Amino acid sequence: KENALLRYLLDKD
Amino acid sequence: SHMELTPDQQTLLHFIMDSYNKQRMPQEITNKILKEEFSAEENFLILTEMATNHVQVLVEFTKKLPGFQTLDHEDQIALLKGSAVEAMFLRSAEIFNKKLPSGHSDLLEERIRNSGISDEYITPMFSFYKSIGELKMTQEEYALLTAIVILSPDRQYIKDREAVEKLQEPLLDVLQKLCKIHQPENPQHFACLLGRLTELRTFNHHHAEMLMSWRVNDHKFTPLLCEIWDV
């Protein structure tokens, strides 16, 4: 996906 | 009472401060500032490590801002990407001005000026650091200003700009009051803080040009930095 790493950090508790 | 936080504002302020104080620079990085070998290559790699940490810390600070996770998910990404450079420069200014010992700051500046980065972009960075330093902001003002930069309704690609504006306006009201509590003799203080956000926005262009210039031995950036800066 786009912005995969940022989305990983955003959705990681 | 035009200068006194209501109970809800004081709760909001504590909550932002808790989130702001939660993370700082890992000792691994501050240790490298002090004892790593000195070369343009080593210095550039420390600075990319610092930037990567800045992004990580900013995401965590932003996730804890009240209301942020109620926003549309694409707008959340749009805010994090849109604000990343301004928030990095604001954070790094505080770190340089207030969070490092003298000597750490001296060696970090020496490493910054000897990292293969052109003086075209280093000189405005240190000018801004001093310009921000002149305001002599408290930790509370720094934290609130940072949250105001992050929750900007004006970033590219925001779908629901009203929703962001609703989150940012209570922070501005709090900051207005903080300026009257902390610098009661300087009525222009809050306007001066917002005046510095104008200089802060010049670093979107400064950073974009820097990314186009040479990189010591043409070293690369971390995946996360490439992603947040659209490299």
PDB file of C-alpha atoms in Angstrom:
ATOM      1  CA  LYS A   1       0.000   0.000   0.000  1.00  0.00           C
ATOM      2  CA  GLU A   2       0.882   3.684  -0.032  1.00  0.00           C
ATOM      3  CA  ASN A   3       2.530   5.109   3.084  1.00  0.00           C
ATOM      4  CA  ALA A   4       2.871   1.601   4.479  1.00  0.00           C
ATOM      5  CA  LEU A   5       5.439   2.474   7.152  1.00  0.00           C
ATOM      6  CA  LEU A   6       3.600   5.523   8.412  1.00  0.00           C
ATOM      7  CA  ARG A   7       0.330   3.548   8.530  1.00  0.00           C
ATOM      8  CA  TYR A   8       2.165   0.791  10.425  1.00  0.00           C
ATOM      9  CA  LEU A   9       3.321   3.313  13.058  1.00  0.00           C
ATOM     10  CA  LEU A  10      -0.059   5.064  13.191  1.00  0.00           C
ATOM     11  CA  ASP A  11      -2.034   1.833  13.804  1.00  0.00           C
ATOM     12  CA  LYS A  12       0.558   0.242  16.162  1.00  0.00           C
ATOM     13  CA  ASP A  13      -0.501   0.531  19.856  1.00  0.00           C
TER      14      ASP A  13
ATOM     15  CA  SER B   1     -10.035  35.261  33.630  1.00  0.00           C
ATOM     16  CA  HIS B   2      -9.200  36.188  30.031  1.00  0.00           C
ATOM     17  CA  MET B   3      -5.766  34.821  31.091  1.00  0.00           C
ATOM     18  CA  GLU B   4      -6.907  31.907  33.316  1.00  0.00           C
ATOM     19  CA  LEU B   5      -7.292  28.355  31.972  1.00  0.00           C
ATOM     20  CA  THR B   6     -10.678  26.804  32.643  1.00  0.00           C
ATOM     21  CA  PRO B   7     -10.633  23.372  34.307  1.00  0.00           C
ATOM     22  CA  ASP B   8     -11.166  21.675  30.933  1.00  0.00           C
ATOM     23  CA  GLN B   9      -8.316  23.711  29.426  1.00  0.00           C
ATOM     24  CA  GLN B  10      -6.045  22.755  32.323  1.00  0.00           C
ATOM     25  CA  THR B  11      -6.940  19.086  31.763  1.00  0.00           C
ATOM     26  CA  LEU B  12      -6.195  19.458  28.053  1.00  0.00           C
ATOM     27  CA  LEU B  13      -2.877  21.137  28.859  1.00  0.00           C
ATOM     28  CA  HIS B  14      -1.826  18.328  31.225  1.00  0.00           C
ATOM     29  CA  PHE B  15      -2.768  15.773  28.608  1.00  0.00           C
ATOM     30  CA  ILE B  16      -0.675  17.446  25.909  1.00  0.00           C
ATOM     31  CA  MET B  17       2.257  17.833  28.331  1.00  0.00           C
ATOM     32  CA  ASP B  18       2.085  14.169  29.340  1.00  0.00           C
ATOM     33  CA  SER B  19       2.236  13.179  25.687  1.00  0.00           C
ATOM     34  CA  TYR B  20       4.999  15.698  24.932  1.00  0.00           C
ATOM     35  CA  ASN B  21       7.198  14.601  27.871  1.00  0.00           C
ATOM     36  CA  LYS B  22       6.719  10.888  27.153  1.00  0.00           C
ATOM     37  CA  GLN B  23       9.611  10.399  24.725  1.00  0.00           C
ATOM     38  CA  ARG B  24      12.923  12.210  24.171  1.00  0.00           C
ATOM     39  CA  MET B  25      16.113  11.266  22.440  1.00  0.00           C
ATOM     40  CA  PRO B  26      17.379   7.714  23.029  1.00  0.00           C
ATOM     41  CA  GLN B  27      20.707   7.693  24.836  1.00  0.00           C
ATOM     42  CA  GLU B  28      22.109   5.606  21.976  1.00  0.00           C
ATOM     43  CA  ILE B  29      21.766   8.686  19.786  1.00  0.00           C
ATOM     44  CA  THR B  30      22.909  11.309  22.273  1.00  0.00           C
ATOM     45  CA  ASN B  31      25.881   9.017  23.072  1.00  0.00           C
ATOM     46  CA  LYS B  32      26.810   8.964  19.350  1.00  0.00           C
ATOM     47  CA  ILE B  33      26.696  12.768  19.277  1.00  0.00           C
ATOM     48  CA  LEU B  34      29.347  12.757  21.982  1.00  0.00           C
ATOM     49  CA  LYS B  35      31.704   9.873  21.121  1.00  0.00           C
ATOM     50  CA  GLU B  36      31.262   8.747  17.492  1.00  0.00           C
ATOM     51  CA  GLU B  37      34.064   9.328  14.982  1.00  0.00           C
ATOM     52  CA  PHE B  38      33.942  12.751  13.317  1.00  0.00           C
ATOM     53  CA  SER B  39      33.619  12.731   9.528  1.00  0.00           C
ATOM     54  CA  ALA B  40      31.101  14.044   7.036  1.00  0.00           C
ATOM     55  CA  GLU B  41      29.933  10.445   6.575  1.00  0.00           C
ATOM     56  CA  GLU B  42      29.537   9.683  10.288  1.00  0.00           C
ATOM     57  CA  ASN B  43      27.898  13.051  10.887  1.00  0.00           C
ATOM     58  CA  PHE B  44      25.356  12.603   8.096  1.00  0.00           C
ATOM     59  CA  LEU B  45      24.442   9.136   9.400  1.00  0.00           C
ATOM     60  CA  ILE B  46      23.880  10.459  12.940  1.00  0.00           C
ATOM     61  CA  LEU B  47      21.659  13.180  11.503  1.00  0.00           C
ATOM     62  CA  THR B  48      19.569  10.625   9.563  1.00  0.00           C
ATOM     63  CA  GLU B  49      19.257   8.529  12.705  1.00  0.00           C
ATOM     64  CA  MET B  50      18.096  11.640  14.579  1.00  0.00           C
ATOM     65  CA  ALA B  51      15.553  12.475  11.868  1.00  0.00           C
ATOM     66  CA  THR B  52      14.200   8.913  11.891  1.00  0.00           C
ATOM     67  CA  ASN B  53      13.748   9.127  15.659  1.00  0.00           C
ATOM     68  CA  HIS B  54      12.090  12.558  15.214  1.00  0.00           C
ATOM     69  CA  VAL B  55       9.457  11.051  12.900  1.00  0.00           C
ATOM     70  CA  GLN B  56       8.812   8.086  15.248  1.00  0.00           C
ATOM     71  CA  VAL B  57       8.431  10.429  18.263  1.00  0.00           C
ATOM     72  CA  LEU B  58       6.176  12.794  16.278  1.00  0.00           C
ATOM     73  CA  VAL B  59       3.814   9.979  15.249  1.00  0.00           C
ATOM     74  CA  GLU B  60       3.531   8.893  18.873  1.00  0.00           C
ATOM     75  CA  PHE B  61       2.963  12.455  20.095  1.00  0.00           C
ATOM     76  CA  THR B  62       0.379  13.065  17.379  1.00  0.00           C
ATOM     77  CA  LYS B  63      -1.576   9.862  18.041  1.00  0.00           C
ATOM     78  CA  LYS B  64      -2.169  11.067  21.587  1.00  0.00           C
ATOM     79  CA  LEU B  65      -3.497  14.502  20.678  1.00  0.00           C
ATOM     80  CA  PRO B  66      -7.173  14.704  21.750  1.00  0.00           C
ATOM     81  CA  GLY B  67      -9.510  14.072  18.830  1.00  0.00           C
ATOM     82  CA  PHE B  68      -6.777  13.066  16.374  1.00  0.00           C
ATOM     83  CA  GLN B  69      -7.756   9.418  16.140  1.00  0.00           C
ATOM     84  CA  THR B  70     -11.400  10.420  15.564  1.00  0.00           C
ATOM     85  CA  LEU B  71     -10.377  11.987  12.257  1.00  0.00           C
ATOM     86  CA  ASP B  72     -10.633  10.201   8.941  1.00  0.00           C
ATOM     87  CA  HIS B  73      -7.690   7.845   8.536  1.00  0.00           C
ATOM     88  CA  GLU B  74      -6.393   9.327   5.269  1.00  0.00           C
ATOM     89  CA  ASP B  75      -6.502  12.803   6.824  1.00  0.00           C
ATOM     90  CA  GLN B  76      -4.470  11.497   9.779  1.00  0.00           C
ATOM     91  CA  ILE B  77      -1.803  10.386   7.283  1.00  0.00           C
ATOM     92  CA  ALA B  78      -2.126  13.688   5.422  1.00  0.00           C
ATOM     93  CA  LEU B  79      -1.492  15.625   8.639  1.00  0.00           C
ATOM     94  CA  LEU B  80       1.525  13.517   9.655  1.00  0.00           C
ATOM     95  CA  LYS B  81       3.094  13.888   6.184  1.00  0.00           C
ATOM     96  CA  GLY B  82       2.156  17.545   5.779  1.00  0.00           C
ATOM     97  CA  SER B  83       3.546  18.586   9.172  1.00  0.00           C
ATOM     98  CA  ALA B  84       6.615  16.339   9.304  1.00  0.00           C
ATOM     99  CA  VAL B  85       9.256  18.850   8.228  1.00  0.00           C
ATOM    100  CA  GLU B  86       7.918  21.776  10.281  1.00  0.00           C
ATOM    101  CA  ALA B  87       7.533  19.577  13.356  1.00  0.00           C
ATOM    102  CA  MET B  88      11.071  18.210  12.880  1.00  0.00           C
ATOM    103  CA  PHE B  89      12.541  21.700  12.737  1.00  0.00           C
ATOM    104  CA  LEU B  90      10.530  22.835  15.740  1.00  0.00           C
ATOM    105  CA  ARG B  91      11.538  19.748  17.734  1.00  0.00           C
ATOM    106  CA  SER B  92      15.189  19.951  16.712  1.00  0.00           C
ATOM    107  CA  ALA B  93      15.222  23.637  17.692  1.00  0.00           C
ATOM    108  CA  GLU B  94      14.000  22.786  21.180  1.00  0.00           C
ATOM    109  CA  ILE B  95      16.539  19.942  21.441  1.00  0.00           C
ATOM    110  CA  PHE B  96      19.371  22.245  20.400  1.00  0.00           C
ATOM    111  CA  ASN B  97      18.181  25.159  22.560  1.00  0.00           C
ATOM    112  CA  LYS B  98      17.000  23.444  25.754  1.00  0.00           C
ATOM    113  CA  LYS B  99      17.453  19.654  25.869  1.00  0.00           C
ATOM    114  CA  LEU B 100      21.157  19.097  25.240  1.00  0.00           C
ATOM    115  CA  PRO B 101      24.041  19.970  27.564  1.00  0.00           C
ATOM    116  CA  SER B 102      26.448  22.599  26.367  1.00  0.00           C
ATOM    117  CA  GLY B 103      29.056  20.642  24.509  1.00  0.00           C
ATOM    118  CA  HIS B 104      26.487  18.208  23.209  1.00  0.00           C
ATOM    119  CA  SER B 105      24.984  21.205  21.435  1.00  0.00           C
ATOM    120  CA  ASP B 106      28.459  22.433  20.466  1.00  0.00           C
ATOM    121  CA  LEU B 107      29.459  19.081  18.972  1.00  0.00           C
ATOM    122  CA  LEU B 108      26.064  18.579  17.308  1.00  0.00           C
ATOM    123  CA  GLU B 109      26.412  21.970  15.598  1.00  0.00           C
ATOM    124  CA  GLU B 110      29.962  21.086  14.575  1.00  0.00           C
ATOM    125  CA  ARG B 111      28.656  17.818  13.133  1.00  0.00           C
ATOM    126  CA  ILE B 112      25.776  19.624  11.383  1.00  0.00           C
ATOM    127  CA  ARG B 113      28.194  22.087   9.748  1.00  0.00           C
ATOM    128  CA  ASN B 114      30.419  19.160   8.644  1.00  0.00           C
ATOM    129  CA  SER B 115      27.942  16.605   7.293  1.00  0.00           C
ATOM    130  CA  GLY B 116      28.135  17.303   3.552  1.00  0.00           C
ATOM    131  CA  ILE B 117      25.038  19.517   3.785  1.00  0.00           C
ATOM    132  CA  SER B 118      25.327  22.824   1.957  1.00  0.00           C
ATOM    133  CA  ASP B 119      25.607  25.995   3.999  1.00  0.00           C
ATOM    134  CA  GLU B 120      22.641  27.293   1.948  1.00  0.00           C
ATOM    135  CA  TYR B 121      20.440  25.163   4.221  1.00  0.00           C
ATOM    136  CA  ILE B 122      22.479  25.077   7.432  1.00  0.00           C
ATOM    137  CA  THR B 123      22.625  28.864   7.831  1.00  0.00           C
ATOM    138  CA  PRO B 124      18.820  29.429   7.852  1.00  0.00           C
ATOM    139  CA  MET B 125      18.446  26.487  10.224  1.00  0.00           C
ATOM    140  CA  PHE B 126      20.733  28.073  12.815  1.00  0.00           C
ATOM    141  CA  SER B 127      19.179  31.486  12.224  1.00  0.00           C
ATOM    142  CA  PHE B 128      15.760  29.975  12.996  1.00  0.00           C
ATOM    143  CA  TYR B 129      17.112  28.197  16.102  1.00  0.00           C
ATOM    144  CA  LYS B 130      18.254  31.545  17.509  1.00  0.00           C
ATOM    145  CA  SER B 131      15.061  33.255  16.344  1.00  0.00           C
ATOM    146  CA  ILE B 132      13.001  30.666  18.231  1.00  0.00           C
ATOM    147  CA  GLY B 133      15.383  30.868  21.187  1.00  0.00           C
ATOM    148  CA  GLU B 134      14.746  34.614  21.497  1.00  0.00           C
ATOM    149  CA  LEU B 135      11.111  33.936  22.392  1.00  0.00           C
ATOM    150  CA  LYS B 136      12.246  32.117  25.561  1.00  0.00           C
ATOM    151  CA  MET B 137       9.226  29.834  25.455  1.00  0.00           C
ATOM    152  CA  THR B 138       8.357  27.509  28.306  1.00  0.00           C
ATOM    153  CA  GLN B 139       7.949  23.780  27.756  1.00  0.00           C
ATOM    154  CA  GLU B 140       4.178  24.258  27.724  1.00  0.00           C
ATOM    155  CA  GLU B 141       4.383  26.839  24.928  1.00  0.00           C
ATOM    156  CA  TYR B 142       6.684  24.572  22.883  1.00  0.00           C
ATOM    157  CA  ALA B 143       4.321  21.619  23.289  1.00  0.00           C
ATOM    158  CA  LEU B 144       1.236  23.632  22.343  1.00  0.00           C
ATOM    159  CA  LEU B 145       2.949  25.267  19.379  1.00  0.00           C
ATOM    160  CA  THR B 146       4.047  21.849  18.138  1.00  0.00           C
ATOM    161  CA  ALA B 147       0.483  20.478  18.387  1.00  0.00           C
ATOM    162  CA  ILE B 148      -0.777  23.558  16.541  1.00  0.00           C
ATOM    163  CA  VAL B 149       1.715  22.920  13.714  1.00  0.00           C
ATOM    164  CA  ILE B 150       0.677  19.267  13.522  1.00  0.00           C
ATOM    165  CA  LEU B 151      -3.065  19.886  13.541  1.00  0.00           C
ATOM    166  CA  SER B 152      -2.966  22.364  10.640  1.00  0.00           C
ATOM    167  CA  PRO B 153      -6.210  22.442   8.575  1.00  0.00           C
ATOM    168  CA  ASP B 154      -4.162  23.781   5.627  1.00  0.00           C
ATOM    169  CA  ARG B 155      -2.091  20.724   4.646  1.00  0.00           C
ATOM    170  CA  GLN B 156      -2.418  19.197   1.216  1.00  0.00           C
ATOM    171  CA  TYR B 157      -5.017  16.427   0.694  1.00  0.00           C
ATOM    172  CA  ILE B 158      -7.092  16.957   3.867  1.00  0.00           C
ATOM    173  CA  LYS B 159     -10.635  15.802   3.126  1.00  0.00           C
ATOM    174  CA  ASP B 160     -12.402  17.238   6.188  1.00  0.00           C
ATOM    175  CA  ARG B 161     -10.627  20.482   6.982  1.00  0.00           C
ATOM    176  CA  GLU B 162     -13.380  21.658   9.362  1.00  0.00           C
ATOM    177  CA  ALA B 163     -12.738  18.655  11.607  1.00  0.00           C
ATOM    178  CA  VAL B 164      -9.051  19.535  11.916  1.00  0.00           C
ATOM    179  CA  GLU B 165      -9.837  23.198  12.517  1.00  0.00           C
ATOM    180  CA  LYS B 166     -12.131  22.155  15.372  1.00  0.00           C
ATOM    181  CA  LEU B 167      -9.173  20.292  16.957  1.00  0.00           C
ATOM    182  CA  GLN B 168      -6.653  23.108  16.442  1.00  0.00           C
ATOM    183  CA  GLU B 169      -8.708  26.057  17.728  1.00  0.00           C
ATOM    184  CA  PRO B 170      -8.859  24.917  21.398  1.00  0.00           C
ATOM    185  CA  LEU B 171      -5.052  24.595  21.337  1.00  0.00           C
ATOM    186  CA  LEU B 172      -4.680  28.175  20.056  1.00  0.00           C
ATOM    187  CA  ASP B 173      -6.996  29.402  22.824  1.00  0.00           C
ATOM    188  CA  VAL B 174      -4.883  27.582  25.396  1.00  0.00           C
ATOM    189  CA  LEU B 175      -1.651  28.989  23.936  1.00  0.00           C
ATOM    190  CA  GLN B 176      -3.044  32.541  23.960  1.00  0.00           C
ATOM    191  CA  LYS B 177      -3.647  32.146  27.675  1.00  0.00           C
ATOM    192  CA  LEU B 178      -0.233  30.540  28.244  1.00  0.00           C
ATOM    193  CA  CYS B 179       1.459  33.610  26.750  1.00  0.00           C
ATOM    194  CA  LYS B 180      -0.391  35.905  29.151  1.00  0.00           C
ATOM    195  CA  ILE B 181       0.445  33.674  32.142  1.00  0.00           C
ATOM    196  CA  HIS B 182       4.103  33.194  31.282  1.00  0.00           C
ATOM    197  CA  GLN B 183       5.022  36.557  29.714  1.00  0.00           C
ATOM    198  CA  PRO B 184       2.469  38.946  31.250  1.00  0.00           C
ATOM    199  CA  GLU B 185       4.636  41.981  30.486  1.00  0.00           C
ATOM    200  CA  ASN B 186       4.871  41.194  26.742  1.00  0.00           C
ATOM    201  CA  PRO B 187       1.390  41.504  25.221  1.00  0.00           C
ATOM    202  CA  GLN B 188       2.698  40.860  21.675  1.00  0.00           C
ATOM    203  CA  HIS B 189       4.165  37.469  22.744  1.00  0.00           C
ATOM    204  CA  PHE B 190       1.446  35.257  21.243  1.00  0.00           C
ATOM    205  CA  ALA B 191       1.646  37.187  17.944  1.00  0.00           C
ATOM    206  CA  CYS B 192       5.416  36.719  18.016  1.00  0.00           C
ATOM    207  CA  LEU B 193       4.982  32.957  18.451  1.00  0.00           C
ATOM    208  CA  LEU B 194       2.687  32.834  15.410  1.00  0.00           C
ATOM    209  CA  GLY B 195       5.123  35.080  13.553  1.00  0.00           C
ATOM    210  CA  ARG B 196       7.765  32.381  14.001  1.00  0.00           C
ATOM    211  CA  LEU B 197       5.447  29.794  12.427  1.00  0.00           C
ATOM    212  CA  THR B 198       5.902  31.870   9.256  1.00  0.00           C
ATOM    213  CA  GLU B 199       9.670  31.405   9.320  1.00  0.00           C
ATOM    214  CA  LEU B 200       9.094  27.733  10.216  1.00  0.00           C
ATOM    215  CA  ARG B 201       7.102  27.235   7.022  1.00  0.00           C
ATOM    216  CA  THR B 202      10.100  28.336   4.925  1.00  0.00           C
ATOM    217  CA  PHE B 203      11.725  25.003   5.768  1.00  0.00           C
ATOM    218  CA  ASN B 204       9.306  23.065   3.566  1.00  0.00           C
ATOM    219  CA  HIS B 205      11.119  24.621   0.592  1.00  0.00           C
ATOM    220  CA  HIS B 206      14.556  24.555   2.279  1.00  0.00           C
ATOM    221  CA  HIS B 207      14.187  20.813   3.056  1.00  0.00           C
ATOM    222  CA  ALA B 208      12.927  19.950  -0.444  1.00  0.00           C
ATOM    223  CA  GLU B 209      15.944  21.667  -2.016  1.00  0.00           C
ATOM    224  CA  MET B 210      18.337  19.967   0.414  1.00  0.00           C
ATOM    225  CA  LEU B 211      16.981  16.562  -0.605  1.00  0.00           C
ATOM    226  CA  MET B 212      17.892  17.421  -4.207  1.00  0.00           C
ATOM    227  CA  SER B 213      21.510  18.310  -3.383  1.00  0.00           C
ATOM    228  CA  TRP B 214      24.459  15.948  -2.924  1.00  0.00           C
ATOM    229  CA  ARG B 215      24.449  13.373  -0.061  1.00  0.00           C
ATOM    230  CA  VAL B 216      27.910  12.425   1.366  1.00  0.00           C
ATOM    231  CA  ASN B 217      29.126   9.529  -0.838  1.00  0.00           C
ATOM    232  CA  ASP B 218      25.506   9.521  -2.123  1.00  0.00           C
ATOM    233  CA  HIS B 219      24.245   7.746   0.975  1.00  0.00           C
ATOM    234  CA  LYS B 220      20.537   6.868   1.128  1.00  0.00           C
ATOM    235  CA  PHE B 221      17.814   7.621   3.644  1.00  0.00           C
ATOM    236  CA  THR B 222      15.939   5.123   5.799  1.00  0.00           C
ATOM    237  CA  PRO B 223      12.712   3.717   4.337  1.00  0.00           C
ATOM    238  CA  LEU B 224      10.612   5.683   6.821  1.00  0.00           C
ATOM    239  CA  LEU B 225      12.211   9.020   5.896  1.00  0.00           C
ATOM    240  CA  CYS B 226      11.883   8.235   2.180  1.00  0.00           C
ATOM    241  CA  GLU B 227       8.216   7.566   2.763  1.00  0.00           C
ATOM    242  CA  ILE B 228       7.344  10.592   4.893  1.00  0.00           C
ATOM    243  CA  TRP B 229       9.319  12.988   2.631  1.00  0.00           C
ATOM    244  CA  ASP B 230       8.123  11.412  -0.679  1.00  0.00           C
ATOM    245  CA  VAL B 231      11.701  10.667  -1.745  1.00  0.00           C
TER     246      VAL B 231
END
